[PDB]
Amino acid sequence: SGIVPTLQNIVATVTLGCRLDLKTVALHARNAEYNPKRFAAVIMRIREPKTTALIFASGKMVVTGAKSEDDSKLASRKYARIIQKIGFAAKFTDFKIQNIVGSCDVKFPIRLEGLAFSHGTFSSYEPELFPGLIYRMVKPKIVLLIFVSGKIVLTGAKQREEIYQAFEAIYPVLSEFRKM
Amino acid sequence: DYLIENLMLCLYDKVTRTKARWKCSLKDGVVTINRNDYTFQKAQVEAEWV
Amino acid sequence: NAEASRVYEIIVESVVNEVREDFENAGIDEQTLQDLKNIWQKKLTE
Amino acid sequence: GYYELYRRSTIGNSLVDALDTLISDGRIEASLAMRVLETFDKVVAETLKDNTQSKLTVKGNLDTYGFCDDVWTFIVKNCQVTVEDQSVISVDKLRIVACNSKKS
DNA sequence: TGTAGTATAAAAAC
DNA sequence: GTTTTATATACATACA
């Protein structure tokens, strides 16, 4: 096709290599929340790249919301520097992208029921529960959410090419079940 | 920057956020703004973090 | 404004009257308590 | 069991300064000033709860926010504050410090 | 009565 | 159970 999924969210993990006192981090970093009754981590945000980090006492960190691999790593380095500047022996090790989410629009309605029946082992469609058809693709290993509108969500990728190949594989099927 | 007067001092009942849109329901406070003071039973804050 | 000026007057009058017992327990002075009240209102006015 | 945050208000700062002056003149001891401030903490809390009726609306850009130890702190920039009991006030920068209405 | 929060449905860290 | 993000339905709850 001439349609390429748009990347929407990238989640990555980073190991800072030192234990952290979360209250100290929250008291010295701007835009930080530390509520141990809610979640054992400091939740911090930066405007650029626009992301949210979950920072743990173990020094492990999760960075979410980036739209490109470059932004994911840059944002992660920025959080590491903030922690370093507060006074912790934080390093930037084992950066790893864990999940990439993409979306696209084929611009034509889909007969979800007929699609689910024909691809029963990969499909889950209970419209009264959730309006999208949940398609679990084997190769590449990607989960797609297919809607009547023709809008598609693709998730579970470790690299962007998996999002692209999953859409290419599903396109013929979507066309096969186009509405009216 | 990243590391750590008109001042409002009060209590919060609820703080919520959707995307970058924050809403805070505050109560029992006092605030000095532009050199004048105001006391209040309730206050609602709607601010965008952008 | 009316509400704020009013709240401040309530606070000052209530604090002064409520700490008279602590003041007396420390054997301070009624005139000293009145001085606290006046310096406080003065600095508030400033 | 009352928050000390109001000591930072205009009325609170004035009381602190007044107490400090009497201490400096050797008229009262710091121990009494502490009891006076503790009473102030309670009186302000009760007065703001029972003797206010106005409602304010604050709208603007959220510059910074933070939460730690049951306290939310926000810095709002270029905001408009509406006071109702017809008055719209504009502020370049407003710092908001809020303690949990549910105390621990 | 038409405008404007909850619930439902990959991955890591705790 | 948090956090992020595209997507879309039903149902709740305010308010002029």
Side-chain angles (χ1 to χ4, degrees), chain A, chain B, chain C, chain D residues 1-84 86-102 104:
Chain A
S1 43
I3 301 170
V4 179
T6 296
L7 302 185
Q8 302 289 3
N9 179 35
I10 296 182
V11 176
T13 48
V14 167
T15 296
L16 298 178
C18 66
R19 279 208 82 85
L20 300 175
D21 183 302
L22 300 186
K23 174 172 169 173
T24 298
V25 173
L27 291 177
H28 294 83
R30 297 187 197 292
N31 311 307
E33 303 165 69
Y34 179 49
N35 189 334
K37 191 174 180 185
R38 286 183 175 188
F39 191 59
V42 163
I43 299 166
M44 192 182 299
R45 301 187 172 84
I46 58 172
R47 292 183 164 79
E48 176 56 51
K50 195 187 74 182
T51 50
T52 298
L54 304 183
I55 297 162
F56 304 83
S58 59
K60 293 307 181 61
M61 181 171 67
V62 174
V63 176
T64 66
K67 291 196 185 299
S68 71
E69 301 89 338
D70 282 359
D71 275 6
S72 178
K73 192 184 287 183
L74 188 67
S76 297
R77 282 182 184 291
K78 193 159 175 179
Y79 286 109
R81 291 206 302 283
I82 289 172
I83 296 302
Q84 266 170 20
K85 284 177 166 299
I86 291 174
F88 291 100
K91 290 294 192 296
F92 189 75
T93 80
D94 290 333
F95 169 79
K96 185 181 181 184
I97 284 172
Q98 301 288 358
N99 184 39
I100 297 172
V101 183
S103 70
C104 57
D105 185 356
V106 300
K107 295 169 187 303
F108 62 71
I110 309 294
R111 290 189 293 104
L112 301 186
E113 179 163 57
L115 195 170
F117 284 136
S118 55
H119 305 68
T121 60
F122 307 126
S123 310
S124 179
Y125 181 52
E126 280 173 56
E128 260 171 48
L129 185 59
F130 183 70
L133 180 159
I134 302 166
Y135 195 97
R136 290 172 188 285
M137 191 174 288
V138 172
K139 179 195 192 63
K141 189 181 173 188
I142 293 295
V143 177
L144 302 82
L145 304 185
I146 305 171
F147 301 89
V148 172
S149 60
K151 291 293 201 300
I152 313 293
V153 167
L154 302 96
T155 190
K158 280 282 190 292
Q159 72 189 84
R160 72 160 77 192
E161 291 73 27
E162 296 169 348
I163 293 301
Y164 301 154
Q165 293 208 298
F167 179 68
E168 288 304 295
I170 204 72
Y171 192 72
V173 181
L174 297 179
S175 250
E176 184 174 346
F177 292 95
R178 179 174 181 168
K179 175 184 288 186
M180 191 72 174
Chain B
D1 49 352
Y2 313 83
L3 303 175
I4 300 172
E5 172 185 48
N6 297 308
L7 174 69
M8 170 180 290
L9 300 165
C10 58
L11 302 178
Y12 66 83
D13 270 350
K14 183 170 61 192
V15 173
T16 59
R17 176 198 58 80
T18 297
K19 284 287 172 62
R21 195 183 182 175
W22 291 71
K23 296 184 177 185
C24 318
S25 297
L26 313 174
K27 62 192 277 236
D28 304 4
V30 56
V31 56
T32 297
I33 289 159
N34 298 332
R35 306 162 299 291
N36 286 301
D37 301 341
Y38 302 78
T39 47
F40 63 80
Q41 169 71 190
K42 295 161 136 53
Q44 303 304 314
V45 180
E46 287 185 49
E48 289 280 343
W49 190 82
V50 199
Chain C
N1 56 76
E3 187 176 59
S5 306
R6 180 80 191 104
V7 164
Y8 285 4
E9 186 60 48
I10 286 172
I11 291 160
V12 175
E13 297 301 326
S14 290
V15 166
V16 170
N17 290 322
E18 274 176 47
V19 304
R20 195 174 263 104
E21 195 174 86
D22 276 353
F23 258 64
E24 303 184 327
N25 283 350
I28 291 302
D29 188 53
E30 169 58 44
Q31 181 59 53
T32 295
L33 176 53
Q34 278 301 313
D35 294 16
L36 171 61
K37 174 184 179 176
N38 292 297
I39 294 174
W40 183 10
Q41 293 182 310
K42 162 183 163 180
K43 285 165 179 298
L44 188 54
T45 288
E46 272 156 38
Chain D
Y2 296 91
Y3 296 121
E4 295 178 12
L5 91 157
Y6 300 114
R7 296 187 193 186
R8 293 164 63 184
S9 62
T10 302
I11 182 163
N13 283 320
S14 295
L15 170 55
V16 168
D17 288 353
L19 285 167
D20 287 335
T21 296
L22 287 173
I23 291 174
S24 290
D25 299 335
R27 305 187 58 186
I28 64 168
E29 302 296 297
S31 54
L32 178 62
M34 176 171 152
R35 286 191 172 82
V36 172
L37 287 165
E38 287 171 337
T39 297
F40 165 86
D41 296 332
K42 175 183 177 189
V43 172
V44 171
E46 303 187 330
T47 302
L48 291 183
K49 180 177 79 296
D50 307 322
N51 299 96
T52 55
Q53 58 79 214
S54 68
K55 309 161 210 313
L56 294 199
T57 296
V58 178
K59 296 183 178 151
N61 300 138
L62 186 63
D63 194 55
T64 69
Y65 65 81
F67 176 87
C68 196
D69 301 307
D70 257 355
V71 179
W72 272 104
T73 295
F74 306 102
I75 297 302
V76 184
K77 284 185 174 177
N78 301 334
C79 64
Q80 295 189 336
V81 177
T82 305
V83 182
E84 62 191 304
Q86 186 57 15
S87 197
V88 183
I89 305 297
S90 301
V91 195
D92 286 357
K93 180 177 174 178
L94 167 66
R95 170 180 293 271
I96 301 179
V97 179
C99 292
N100 198 331
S101 59
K102 299 181 289 164
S104 287

